[PDB]
Ligand binder design. Sequence first.
Ligand SMILES: Nc1ncc(Cl)c(Nc2ccccc2)n1
Length: 130
Amino acid sequence: LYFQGADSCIQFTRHASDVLLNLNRLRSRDILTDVVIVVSREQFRAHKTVLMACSGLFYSIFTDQLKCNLSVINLDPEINPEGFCILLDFMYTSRLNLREGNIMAVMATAMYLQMEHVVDTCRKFIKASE
Ligand SMILES: Nc1ncc(Cl)c(Nc2ccccc2)n1
């Protein structure tokens, strides 16, 4: 459906989430992926534009005239790959699968990737356990 937005335009309620859904479908089928992210010898294929849109670290890398052409990016080998996988799924879905058993790895990975809204959110959930 659609509605009249604050600017008097027609606004499509599901458009942004539908675009993201379609980008995730492309990722799952490996269509137009243009980078591999390597974490602890695990490989993750993705779209650079989605990475940049969600992460300060990826934004900096892919706006750098030298690094923007790399098709393989290695992360710190101490990064937990499940932490990365969770954040990558978040990027492509808006859904963050936080659990007691993964929250610290997810928070550390989000800090490394410069995903500040995710970092803040992990803080509140940790602080509520205390
Ligand atoms: N199912 C699917 N998966 C991925 C993409 Cl990118 C896509 N795009 C698209 C297809 C038809 C009409 C409008 C958009 N559709």
